[PDB]
Write an enzyme that holds these catalytic residues in place. Structure first.
Site, PDB file in Angstrom:
ATOM      1  N   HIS A   1       0.820  -1.203   0.000  1.00  0.00           N
ATOM      2  CA  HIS A   1       0.000   0.000   0.000  1.00  0.00           C
ATOM      3  C   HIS A   1       0.855   1.256   0.000  1.00  0.00           C
ATOM      4  O   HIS A   1       0.432   2.291  -0.526  1.00  0.00           O
ATOM      5  CB  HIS A   1      -0.937  -0.015   1.206  1.00  0.00           C
ATOM      6  CG  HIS A   1      -1.768   1.219   1.335  1.00  0.00           C
ATOM      7  ND1 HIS A   1      -2.977   1.374   0.691  1.00  0.00           N
ATOM      8  CD2 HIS A   1      -1.565   2.360   2.032  1.00  0.00           C
ATOM      9  CE1 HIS A   1      -3.481   2.557   0.985  1.00  0.00           C
ATOM     10  NE2 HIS A   1      -2.643   3.176   1.797  1.00  0.00           N
TER      11      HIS A   1
ATOM     12  N   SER B   1      -0.267  -0.588  -6.201  1.00  0.00           N
ATOM     13  CA  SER B   1      -0.439  -1.856  -6.894  1.00  0.00           C
ATOM     14  C   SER B   1      -0.007  -1.733  -8.351  1.00  0.00           C
ATOM     15  O   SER B   1       0.093  -0.635  -8.903  1.00  0.00           O
ATOM     16  CB  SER B   1      -1.895  -2.328  -6.812  1.00  0.00           C
ATOM     17  OG  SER B   1      -2.052  -3.602  -7.409  1.00  0.00           O
TER      18      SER B   1
ATOM     19  N   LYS C   1     -15.100  -9.150  -7.416  1.00  0.00           N
ATOM     20  CA  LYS C   1     -14.166  -9.992  -8.162  1.00  0.00           C
ATOM     21  C   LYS C   1     -13.434 -10.967  -7.246  1.00  0.00           C
ATOM     22  O   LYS C   1     -13.291 -12.152  -7.574  1.00  0.00           O
ATOM     23  CB  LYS C   1     -13.167  -9.128  -8.928  1.00  0.00           C
ATOM     24  CG  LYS C   1     -12.348  -9.908  -9.939  1.00  0.00           C
ATOM     25  CD  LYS C   1     -12.148  -9.125 -11.220  1.00  0.00           C
ATOM     26  CE  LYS C   1     -10.866  -9.535 -11.919  1.00  0.00           C
ATOM     27  NZ  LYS C   1     -10.757  -8.912 -13.266  1.00  0.00           N
ATOM     28  N   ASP C   2     -12.980 -10.495  -6.084  1.00  0.00           N
ATOM     29  CA  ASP C   2     -12.339 -11.379  -5.123  1.00  0.00           C
ATOM     30  C   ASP C   2     -13.328 -12.354  -4.508  1.00  0.00           C
ATOM     31  O   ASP C   2     -12.947 -13.477  -4.182  1.00  0.00           O
ATOM     32  CB  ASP C   2     -11.636 -10.553  -4.047  1.00  0.00           C
ATOM     33  CG  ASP C   2     -10.433  -9.798  -4.589  1.00  0.00           C
ATOM     34  OD1 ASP C   2     -10.446  -9.420  -5.780  1.00  0.00           O
ATOM     35  OD2 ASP C   2      -9.484  -9.555  -3.819  1.00  0.00           O
TER      36      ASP C   2
ATOM     37  N   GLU D   1       6.350 -33.899   0.036  1.00  0.00           N
ATOM     38  CA  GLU D   1       5.108 -33.470  -0.588  1.00  0.00           C
ATOM     39  C   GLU D   1       5.384 -32.821  -1.942  1.00  0.00           C
ATOM     40  O   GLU D   1       6.518 -32.461  -2.268  1.00  0.00           O
ATOM     41  CB  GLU D   1       4.356 -32.504   0.325  1.00  0.00           C
ATOM     42  CG  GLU D   1       3.597 -33.185   1.457  1.00  0.00           C
ATOM     43  CD  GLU D   1       2.333 -33.884   0.989  1.00  0.00           C
ATOM     44  OE1 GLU D   1       2.427 -35.009   0.454  1.00  0.00           O
ATOM     45  OE2 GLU D   1       1.239 -33.306   1.157  1.00  0.00           O
TER      46      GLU D   1
HETATM   47  C1  HEM Z   1       1.198 -15.843   2.993  1.00  0.00           C
HETATM   48  C2  HEM Z   1       1.749 -15.274   1.914  1.00  0.00           C
HETATM   49  C3  HEM Z   1       1.257 -14.004   1.163  1.00  0.00           C
HETATM   50  C4  HEM Z   1       0.188 -13.200   1.348  1.00  0.00           C
HETATM   51  C5  HEM Z   1      -0.951 -13.269   2.393  1.00  0.00           C
HETATM   52  C6  HEM Z   1       0.238 -12.163   0.342  1.00  0.00           C
HETATM   53  C7  HEM Z   1      -0.672 -11.145   0.190  1.00  0.00           C
HETATM   54  C8  HEM Z   1      -0.740 -10.313  -0.901  1.00  0.00           C
HETATM   55  C9  HEM Z   1      -1.884  -9.531  -1.309  1.00  0.00           C
HETATM   56  C10 HEM Z   1      -3.242  -9.491  -0.578  1.00  0.00           C
HETATM   57  C11 HEM Z   1      -1.556  -8.861  -2.415  1.00  0.00           C
HETATM   58  C12 HEM Z   1      -2.477  -7.901  -3.196  1.00  0.00           C
HETATM   59  C13 HEM Z   1      -3.337  -8.698  -4.171  1.00  0.00           C
HETATM   60  C14 HEM Z   1      -2.500  -9.145  -5.336  1.00  0.00           C
HETATM   61  O1  HEM Z   1      -1.792  -8.290  -5.926  1.00  0.00           O
HETATM   62  O2  HEM Z   1      -2.547 -10.352  -5.682  1.00  0.00           O
HETATM   63  C15 HEM Z   1      -0.186  -9.196  -2.751  1.00  0.00           C
HETATM   64  C16 HEM Z   1       0.546  -8.726  -3.815  1.00  0.00           C
HETATM   65  C17 HEM Z   1       1.892  -8.942  -4.004  1.00  0.00           C
HETATM   66  N1  HEM Z   1       2.620  -9.969  -3.441  1.00  0.00           N
HETATM   67 FE1  HEM Z   1       2.009 -11.124  -1.946  1.00  0.00          FE
HETATM   68  N2  HEM Z   1       1.352 -12.357  -0.439  1.00  0.00           N
HETATM   69  C18 HEM Z   1       1.998 -13.475   0.036  1.00  0.00           C
HETATM   70  C19 HEM Z   1       3.159 -14.000  -0.480  1.00  0.00           C
HETATM   71  C20 HEM Z   1       3.949 -13.391  -1.426  1.00  0.00           C
HETATM   72  C21 HEM Z   1       5.067 -13.994  -2.119  1.00  0.00           C
HETATM   73  C22 HEM Z   1       5.500 -15.456  -1.861  1.00  0.00           C
HETATM   74  C23 HEM Z   1       5.563 -13.079  -2.978  1.00  0.00           C
HETATM   75  C24 HEM Z   1       6.759 -13.128  -3.966  1.00  0.00           C
HETATM   76  C25 HEM Z   1       7.794 -13.976  -3.914  1.00  0.00           C
HETATM   77  C26 HEM Z   1       4.776 -11.875  -2.823  1.00  0.00           C
HETATM   78  C27 HEM Z   1       4.955 -10.697  -3.510  1.00  0.00           C
HETATM   79  C28 HEM Z   1       3.927  -9.853  -3.860  1.00  0.00           C
HETATM   80  C29 HEM Z   1       4.009  -8.702  -4.726  1.00  0.00           C
HETATM   81  C30 HEM Z   1       5.280  -8.193  -5.425  1.00  0.00           C
HETATM   82  C31 HEM Z   1       2.797  -8.157  -4.815  1.00  0.00           C
HETATM   83  C32 HEM Z   1       2.436  -6.906  -5.638  1.00  0.00           C
HETATM   84  C33 HEM Z   1       1.713  -7.325  -6.910  1.00  0.00           C
HETATM   85  C34 HEM Z   1       1.254  -6.106  -7.659  1.00  0.00           C
HETATM   86  O3  HEM Z   1       1.527  -4.971  -7.194  1.00  0.00           O
HETATM   87  O4  HEM Z   1       0.612  -6.273  -8.726  1.00  0.00           O
HETATM   88  N3  HEM Z   1       3.797 -12.100  -1.882  1.00  0.00           N
HETATM   89  N4  HEM Z   1       0.276 -10.085  -1.805  1.00  0.00           N
END
Ligand code: HEM
Ligand SMILES: CCCCCCCCCCCCCCCCCC(=O)OC[C@H](COP(=O)([O-])OCC(O)COP(=O)([O-])OC[C@@H](COC(=O)CCCCCCCCCCCCCCCCC)OC(=O)CCCCCCCCCCCCCCCCC)OC(=O)CCCCCCCCCCCCCCCCC
Ligand SMILES: CCCCCCCCCCCCCCCCCC(=O)OC[C@H](COP(=O)([O-])OCC(O)COP(=O)([O-])OC[C@@H](COC(=O)CCCCCCCCCCCCCCCCC)OC(=O)CCCCCCCCCCCCCCCCC)OC(=O)CCCCCCCCCCCCCCCCC
Ligand SMILES: CCCCCCCCCCCCCCCCCC(=O)OC[C@H](COP(=O)([O-])OCC[N+](C)(C)C)OC(=O)CCCCCCCCCCCCCCCCC
Ligand SMILES: CCCCCCCCCCCCCCCCCC(=O)OC[C@H](COP(=O)(O)OCCN)OC(=O)CCCCCCCCCCCCCCCCC
Ligand SMILES: CCCCCCCCCCCCCCCCCC(=O)OC[C@H](COP(=O)(O)OCCN)OC(=O)CCCCCCCCCCCCCCCCC
Ligand code: HEC
Ligand code: HEM
Lengths: 102, 240, 32, 380, 51, 68, 77, 60
Positions: free
Chosen positions: D201, D205, D227-228, D271
């Site tokens: 945030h 995004s 959508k979600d 796994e």
């Molecule tokens: C328990 C694990 C995680 C949670 C709860 C989480 C949560 C979120 C959420 C809610 C968003 C916004 C919705 C979306 O763009 O899809 C997001 C975006 C993002 N996540 Fe995660 N995430 C997790 C793991 C990760 C991992 C494993 C990576 C990368 C190796 C990561 C990197 C990013 C990035 C770079 C964004 C920005 C995407 C954009 O701006 O379009 N996150 N994450």
């Protein structure tokens, strides 16, 4: 020769896909600090044209569609409008880095 | 040798995505297990209280639970006594410890058949193929006594004597107790013992598919209705 | 001019009950 | 009269984060997976809370407690298989999350990417210890495999494996401390997810085109709310058909036997979501080399933002790097498969070439493709 | 080449003693926290407690 | 002995199926090959497994209509 | 950062209709199938051949493994 | 010319409170109807295989 390279560049330009959204190469350049400086140095009409093209590309990507083939921008008409501003910004940054190093 | 023989895909009455078990077949398989398989194998995670409600009436389950004698205690003076079994009691151990089972079964340990279908590759197909797949060893395969050739057993030298044959028990339904019928019934019973939630889970899945085939077009319609403002939005640029 | 601003045709997305320009609304709004 | 939604402090934080958040109007279904991961985390928390309500972390009573949950507890079979297939769905959503980040150039959010990498480590550790928890044969033997692989470290490995084991092997203390860690670590995952969302945030995004999306932004509600919700419904459809029809194809039958130290399984595998790392560690024929290859193959995601050599953010207009990325995904599929079958012929050379090609594509080939792509677009 | 230059070289030269002293601080803290035998069986006093 | 086995009737019918006939031909070829030699470690498990795969596949198509 | 001051846009007019007055599935198939086919045509050459060679080397590896488990008739002399 | 959705909106879908009442009553009646229909579909798919189908042989 240069003709084959130009033809293969045309084929890559069709294959890239940003011409189908009405975009340009300078439109699809990623905004770093130097790029943002170039956009802020742009004149008013070019700024408005670029932002409208970006907005239309976002709308088309939202609808998962493209422009009609008539309205695709052509490789010959792709204006390199951000190139001089970007080159000047890079030159100024390199001058600043050289002065900081010396 | 090092090869494995894959059991074939038999057309069970529960192999469909909405098909339940044949409860009469589970009854016959439980009878097969009680009169044949219970002397060596254990079923410690299945009880007569599990049996009642899917195969037997409460009175019948109580009768076949009281027909076996179980060890209980302690009493007032502290002595292990013996009493007839109840519904809450589990199936009795044929051996007190696995070492006694190995001693009485020529070293081989008969595994607990409460998760054998869920714990073997193929499951009920593997059980059917193992029970009906006993054959004479081929040339060059010398097997010492106490081991029997079985192509579906990994290692091909099982420590199990052929447990079932023609007229190995008597059914209460008058069904012919042939080898294949007995094997199919006991495989159905072992599948039930591995997954007692089978028919209930299938009913959950049927309700889930009907419910989600109702919900998904309607939720998609709500999404398209909310997003119809943007998907039909028109943009115009009018510089002066 | 702002008078040249005309809303484009929406008949490719609009419902059948309000597809006619001469037919009044508020008689199919409850249905929609 | 005041606007309570943007006046009340908790309400205005919720409004500025989730309700009135300016989101890009053109983000596809690949942007639902963050909320899918959050919903999967909540589902895991609830289902594992009930499983621990009916679960005892004793070596003698772990397997019997799991059977008691499956058979005697009302819908405890549903809870347990919801937990397991939700772990499979969690790793599916994690892999698609990481794939979105790699394809659409989301790693330029460096701190958000690093917090995500730490989240990926925490979820992998959580799922590993949870898979150890039912005290099956494959659970115990996979625990021994992973702990010995950690013990391969020189001068530190033996003391660390004796410290983590709580003894000399996987035993009572190991199982009990794995239960405690598996209970506590998803809450650390949740807190790190708040940190993840806070950094995101702060940065805003990203749209699939990789451009500046501030020209066309829409409120998160009701558009991405519905959508979600649709994405949550589809994810529940896949999770529930996995629970109620195919509950064992992503599981392992050998986990349904009690953990026997004296008897080994025929083919030991972890796994399915550990299979690519297992395959590369089998591919490099050195214990220290294998564990370092695993560690570097997961840290290379954190190393990723320093490999961006292109003037375009997303791969939407980068066809050569698109081809390289899809070859990378194909190679990850090959690595999962090779982690599937044991280490024999020709799986030796297939796994070795798969690991070498994987590292070569993710380190050398993609920046070279970006450089020649910029040259082909006449950038320098 | 941003960090390669004479001003950066002499700034690094000023920061070698401080970084080296911080590395000594970290090393001494690591030995003290872990009770490392390979170092702590050479100082005179601390040799007493290991017997 | 009085009650004939639907299992063994399906088994013999799948022997009458021709792919299993070729499999038994390889089986007798292996049997004579192993038997007409001493001091060898070759067994006929491969051909037996191929025959059993084919024959049990035929049985698995065509058995359970005969059972209750 | 807030929704009121994000970017500077001039001379741009947006037209939108009411969701209760326009359809939710406006010709969902007639211009829906060609759009999906167009998207597949644009992005099928960069996606399919990697998974094609996955299938090829998957089949080759399984065939080579089964041939390795198959015995070699060369032990006679 | 008033249609069934028009009457539904003018009676039940207008106010949020009576909207929620319609949702709750529909949830009750649809829960019973869907349970009955899905159960009957399950019985017709698995005729002669369930305990509720075979208990009459072994009772009384
Ligand atoms: C328990 C694990 C995680 C949670 C709860 C989480 C949560 C979120 C959420 C809610 C968003 C916004 C919705 C979306 O763009 O899809 C997001 C975006 C993002 N996540 Fe995660 N995430 C997790 C793991 C990760 C991992 C494993 C990576 C990368 C190796 C990561 C990197 C990013 C990035 C770079 C964004 C920005 C995407 C954009 O701006 O379009 N996150 N994450
Ligand atoms: C190495 C990387 C090379 C990258 C070359 C490049 O720029 O490709 C972009 C180019 C863009 O094509 P496209 O714009 O998607 O074409 C679809 C258009 O709608 C229609 O465009 P099109 O019809 O012109 O494309 C058809 C296609 C040829 O494809 C066909 O004719 C289809 C039938 C299958 C062959 O390509 C050509 O005829 C010219 C290709 C020139 C390449 C230089 O993509 C490909 O050529 C596909 C990838 C080919 C290489 C795959 C290598 C995998 C090897 C195994 C890995 C493990
Ligand atoms: C030939 C194939 C069918 C072609 C066809 O009818 O295309 C129509 C239509 C063509 O789309 P279009 O009109 O060119 O533009 C997209 C729409 O404007 C806007 O529609 P959309 O597809 O962009 O909607 C956003 C997206 C939202 O997607 C999500 O929320 C899903 C998020 C990912 C969930 C992943 C779960 C885990 C997966 C593990 C593997 O929706 C979907 O992906 C469709 C969900 C359908 C659910 C079942 C409905 C019955 O495609 C669909 O509606 C797709 C679903 C077709 C069924
Ligand atoms: C930092 C790496 C070295 C840590 C270390 O060895 O500390 C010494 C101390 C004590 O080492 P020690 O010298 O008493 O011997 C333990 C090491 N073996 C038995 C293999 C010779 O180790 C630890 O405290 C473990 C730290 C792990 C991190
Ligand atoms: C997967 C099957 C193929 C999916 C597909 O259709 O991909 C094509 C799609 C094209 O998307 P795009 O390039 O944005 O096109 C714009 C046109 N409107 O391209 C995409 O959607 C690209 C993003 C796909 C992300 C998921 C696939 C990869 C998943 C595994 C990633 C693993 C990364 C490493 C993790 C372990 C470490
Ligand atoms: C062997 C012969 C194979 C022939 C294959 C032909 C495939 C045609 C696919 C296609 O694009 O169909 C288009 C058709 C109608 O779409 P369109 O052409 O836009 O017409 C406007 C008015 N309906 O789309 C439809 O009719 C949609 C049908 C959905 C079911
Ligand atoms: C005492 C003679 C037994 C009878 C009666 C039954 N089984 Fe058995 N079984 C017995 C032993 C000693 C063993 C171990 C053999 C070995 O080599 O491990 C077994 C094993 C099994 C297995 C496991 C096979 C595997 O690959 O793990 C199964 C599935 C099995 N037995 C089935 C089974 C059934 C269904 C029985 C009732 C008809 C039955 N066995 C009876 C000893 C004895
Ligand atoms: C607060 C959160 C959680 C709690 C309290 C919890 C608790 C438990 C318990 C008690 C078990 C034993 C039941 C069993 O073995 O089936 C278990 C198993 C398991 N857990 Fe969790 N868990 C939580 C979150 C997670 C998460 C986030 C993941 C993965 C991303 C996960 C993955 C697993 C797996 C794979 C198993 C094995 C299930 C099986 O083998 O059948 N858990 N967990």
């Amino acid at each position: 020769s240069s003709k084959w390279l130009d033809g293969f560049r045309k084929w890559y330009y069709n294959a890239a896909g940003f011409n189908k959204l009405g975009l340009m190469r300078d439109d699809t350049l990623h905004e770093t600090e130097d790029v943002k400086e170039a956009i802020r140095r742009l004149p008013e009409d070019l700024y408005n044209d670029r932002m409208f093209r970006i907005k239309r590309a976002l709308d088309l990507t939202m609808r998962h569609q493209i422009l009609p083939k008539d309205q695709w921008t052509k490789y010959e008409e792709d204006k390199f409008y951000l190139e001089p501003y970007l080159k000047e910004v890079i030159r100024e940054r390199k001058e600043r880095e050289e002065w900081a190093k010396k | 040798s090092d090869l494995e023989l894959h059991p074939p895909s038999y057309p069970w009455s529960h192999r469909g995505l909405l098909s339940s078990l044949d409860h009469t077949s589970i009854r016959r398989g439980f009878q097969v297990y009680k009169q044949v398989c219970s002397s060596c194998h254990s079923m410690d995670y299945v009880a007569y209280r599990h049996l009642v409600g899917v195969c037997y009436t409460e009175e019948e389950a109580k009768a076949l639970a009281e027909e076996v004698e179980v060890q209980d205690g302690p009493n007032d003076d502290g002595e292990m006594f013996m009493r007839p079994g109840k519904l809450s009691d589990y199936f009795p151990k044929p051996y007190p410890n696995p070492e006694a089972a190995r001693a009485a079964n020529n070293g081989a340990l008969p595994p607990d058949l409460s998760y054998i279908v869920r714990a073997r590759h193929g499951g009920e197909d593997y059980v059917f193929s193992l029970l009906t797949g006993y054959c004479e060893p081929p040339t060059g395969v010398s097997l010492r006594e106490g081991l029997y050739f079985n192509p579906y057993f990994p290692g091909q030298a099982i420590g199990m004597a052929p447990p079932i044959y023609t007229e190995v028990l008597e059914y209460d339904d008058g069904t012919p107790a042939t080898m294949s019928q007995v094997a199919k019934d006991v495989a159905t019973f072992l599948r039930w013992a591995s997954e007692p939630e089978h028919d209930h889970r299938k009913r959950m899945g049927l309700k889930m598919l009907l419910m989600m085939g109702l919900l998904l077009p309607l939720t998609y319609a709500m999404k398209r209705h909310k997003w119809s403002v943007l998907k039909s939005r028109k943009l115009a640029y009018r510089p002066p | 001019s702002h008078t040249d601003v005309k809303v484009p045709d929406f008949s490719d997305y609009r419902r059948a009950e309000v597809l006619d320009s001469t037919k009044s609304s508020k008689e199919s709004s409850e249905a929609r | 009269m005041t606007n309570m939604r943007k006046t009340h402090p908790l309400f205005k934080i919720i409004n500025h984060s989730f309700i009135d958040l300016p989101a890009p109007s053109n983000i596809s279904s690949w942007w639902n997976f963050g909320s899918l991961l959050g919903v999967c985390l909540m589902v895991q928390i609830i289902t594992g809370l009930f499983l621990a309500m009916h679960y005892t972390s004793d070596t003698m009573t772990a397997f019997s407690s799991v059977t008691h949950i499956c058979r005697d507890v009302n819908y405890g079979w549903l809870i347990r298989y919801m937990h397991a297939n939700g772990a499979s769905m969690f790793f599916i959503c994690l892999f698609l999350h990481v794939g979105r980040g790699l394809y659409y150039g989301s790693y330029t959010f460096m701190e958000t990417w690093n917090i995500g990498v730490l989240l990926l480590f925490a979820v992998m550790a959580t799922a590993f210890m949870g898979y150890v928890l039912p005290w099956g044969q494959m659970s115990f033997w996979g625990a021994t495999v992973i702990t010995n692989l950690l013990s391969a470290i020189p001068y530190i490995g033996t003391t660390l494996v004796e410290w983590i084991w709580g003894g000399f092997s996987v035993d009572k203390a190991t199982l009990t401390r794995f239960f405690a860690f598996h209970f506590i670590l998803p809450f650390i995952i949740a807190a790190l997810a708040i940190v993840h969302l806070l950094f995101l945030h702060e940065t805003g995004s990203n749209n699939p085109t990789g451009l500046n999306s501030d020209a066309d932004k829409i409120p998160f509600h009701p558009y991405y709310t519905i959508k979600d919700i649709l994405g949550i419904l589809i994810m529940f459809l896949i999770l529930m058909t996995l629970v109620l029809f195919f509950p064992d194809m992503l599981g392992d039958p050998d986990n349904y036997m009690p953990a026997n130290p004296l008897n080994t399984p025929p083919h030991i595998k972890p796994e399915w979501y550990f299979l690519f790392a297992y395959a590369i560690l089998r591919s490099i024929p050195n214990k220290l080399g294998g564990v370092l290859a695993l560690i570097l193959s997961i840290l290379i995601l954190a190393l990723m933002p320093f490999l961006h050599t292109s003037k375009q953010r997303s791969l939407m207009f980068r066809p050569i790097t698109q081809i390289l990325y899809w070859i990378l995904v194909a190679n990850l599929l090959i690595l999962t498969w090779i982690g599937g079958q044991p280490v024999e012929h020709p799986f030796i050379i297939i796994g070795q070439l798969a690991s070498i090609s994987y590292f070569s594509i993710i380190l050398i080939l993609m920046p070279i493709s970006g450089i020649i792509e910029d040259k082909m677009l006449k950038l320098y | 080449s941003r960090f390669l230059g004479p001003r950066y070289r002499e700034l690094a030269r000023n920061w070698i003693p401080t970084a080296g002293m911080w590395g000594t601080v970290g090393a001494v803290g690591l030995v003290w926290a872990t009770d490392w035998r390979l170092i702590l069986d050479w100082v005179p006093y601390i040799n007493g407690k290991f017997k | 002995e009085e009650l004939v086995d639907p299992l063994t009737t399906v088994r013999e019918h799948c022997e009458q199926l021709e792919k299993c006939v070729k499999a038994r031909e390889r089986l007798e070829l292996c049997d004579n090959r192993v038997s007409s030699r001493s001091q060898t470690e070759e067994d006929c498990t491969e051909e037996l497994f191929d025959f059993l795969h084919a024959r049990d596949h035929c049985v698995a198509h065509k058995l359970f209509k005969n059972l209750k | 950062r807030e929704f009121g001051n994000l970017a500077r846009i001039r001379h741009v007019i947006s037209y939108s209709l009411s969701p209760f007055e326009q359809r939710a599935f406006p010709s969902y198939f007639s211009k829906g199938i060609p759009n999906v086919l167009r998207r597949t045509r644009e992005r099928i050459l960069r996606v399919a051949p990697p998974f094609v060679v996955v299938y090829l080397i998957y089949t080759w590896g399984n065939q080579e493994f089964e041939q390795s488990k198959r015995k070699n008739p060369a032990m006679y002399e | 010319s008033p249609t069934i959705p028009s009457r539904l909106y003018s009676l039940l879908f207008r106010r949020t409170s009576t909207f929620a009442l319609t949702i709750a009553v529909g949830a009750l009646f649809f829960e019973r109807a869907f349970d009955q229909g899905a159960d009957a579909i399950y019985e017709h798919i698995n005729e002669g295989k369930l305990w509720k189908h075979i208990k009459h042989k072994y009772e009384n």
